[PDB]
Symmetry: C2
Subunit: 174 residues, 2 copies
């Protein structure tokens, strides 16, 4: 079972010029408590809040988190949103107002039935030093770097239980 290398290539088309400036801008995750999510993504993971949007009638907010230098954020609001929403590799965290006050409410991480989405993943220079710091800050682990079959690869979870892979691309050939 599983596709051959040749079968996978037989399915691939080269990029049409009509797509040439397309970019993979965002992954959207719903978050129960934006106070906990903002602290985790900024203080623990080192992302920057690059844009906040509020929809007061539909009762939700969007938080765009990215690995960007805060000094690169434009000061004028229309330029800032066009900059933020043209960054590659952002996270769009959706806060449905009031979930943080609902003891019975939680989101689903995709890793138990019914499955779909699995994880986001962060590339780091050193999985072990990254994970030592995560452990010092009280991050919950799904998989410590040396636990299980694949040594030197970790999974943490965010405040909603979403899985985050921590990988060092220079060690992955092994």
């Amino acid at each position: 079972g599983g596709l051959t290398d040749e079968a996978a290539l037989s399915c691939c088309s080269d990029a049409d010029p009509s797509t040439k400036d397309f970019l993979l801008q965002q992954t959207m995750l719903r978050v129960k408590d934006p106070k906990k999510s903002l602290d985790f993504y900024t203080r623990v993971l080192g992302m920057t809040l690059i844009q906040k949007c509020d929809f007061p009638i539909m009762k939700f907010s969007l938080y765009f988190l990215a690995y960007e230098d805060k000094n690169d954020i434009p000061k004028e609001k229309d330029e800032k949103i066009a900059w933020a929403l043209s960054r590659k590799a952002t996270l769009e965290l959706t806060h449905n107002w009031g979930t943080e006050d609902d003891e019975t409410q939680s989101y689903h991480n995709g890793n138990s039935d019914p499955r779909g989405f699995g994880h986001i993943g962060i590339a780091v220079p050193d999985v072990y030093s990254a994970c030592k710091r995560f452990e010092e800050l009280g991050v919950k682990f799904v998989k410590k770097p040396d636990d299980g079959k694949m040594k030197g690869l970790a999974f943490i979870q965010d405040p909603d239980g979403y899985w985050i892979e921590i990988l060092n691309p220079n060690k992955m050939a092994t």
Copy 2:
């Protein structure tokens, strides 16, 4: 409800120097049928297959898709994996072998109970021209750009039913920053 701009900013901390080389490398989605997913992501959305990994004991494959020039892909296998897994903004599609032949099997897109993940999103130069092409390619739409509350933004679905936003960054101020009427 919801945080004020000041309250949200106050919940943020400046990035620790130990994180300054971290990058958001991948989003992982499980796919029923890799042939349909590869045709969709390469041909319809214009991504490149940059790495394929097979795990014969665990019976799954990984496909890494990205907006990269195929001429940048190293030929040597270990250099190629290090290159592919150091790209920002990749999609990691996980094929659990045998799903493609199981008429009763489908993955969950996160947009009905139980919710969590919602979508990925593609920034394009022109949502209307992109969507006209998508219509010509028989893409299934969730939301056309001229329907619903958020005009100028589209949602399409991939072969597993995952939602993909189609957005133009230069149209998002009017969509997201303008004063909205109460009825």
